[PDB]
Amino acid sequence: KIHPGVAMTVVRTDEILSENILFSSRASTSMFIGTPNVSRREARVDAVTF
Amino acid sequence: KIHPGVAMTVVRTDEILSENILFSSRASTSMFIGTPNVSRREARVDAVTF
């Protein structure tokens, strides 16, 4: 327990799982939502996948 | 052509084409015929394989 001639300043990161709050004012963005396309992918005899 | 100390027991399995007869009484198995369905498998540029 002899103190050396230097001084150490120990640095560490700390990962913290926080819980944010999101505000967004009335009519902030504007969405142009279109009618979706449907495409029959799996032409199976057991079950069809659209 | 002098006998060794042992003998042998030669085992062959011999196949036979046999014409069979199958009896099966009426209402043996009940069936459910599903409707047949088509689907393309190998859609080659030369010829589509259904």
Q: A27 near B21, Cβ under 8 Å?
A: no
Q: Which residues of A touch B39 (CB under 8 A)?
A: 43-45
Resolution (A): 3.8
A45, A46, A48, A49, best to mutate vs chain B, most B CBs in 10 Å: A45
| Cα separation, A47 vs A4, whole angstroms | 75
b/e per residue A4-23 (b: at least 16 CB within 10 A) = eeeeeeeeeeeeeeeeeeee
Q: Which residues of A touch B50 (CB under 8 A)?
A: none
Rounded to 5°, angle at Cα B16 from B12 and B19 = 160
DSSP 8-state code for residue B12: -
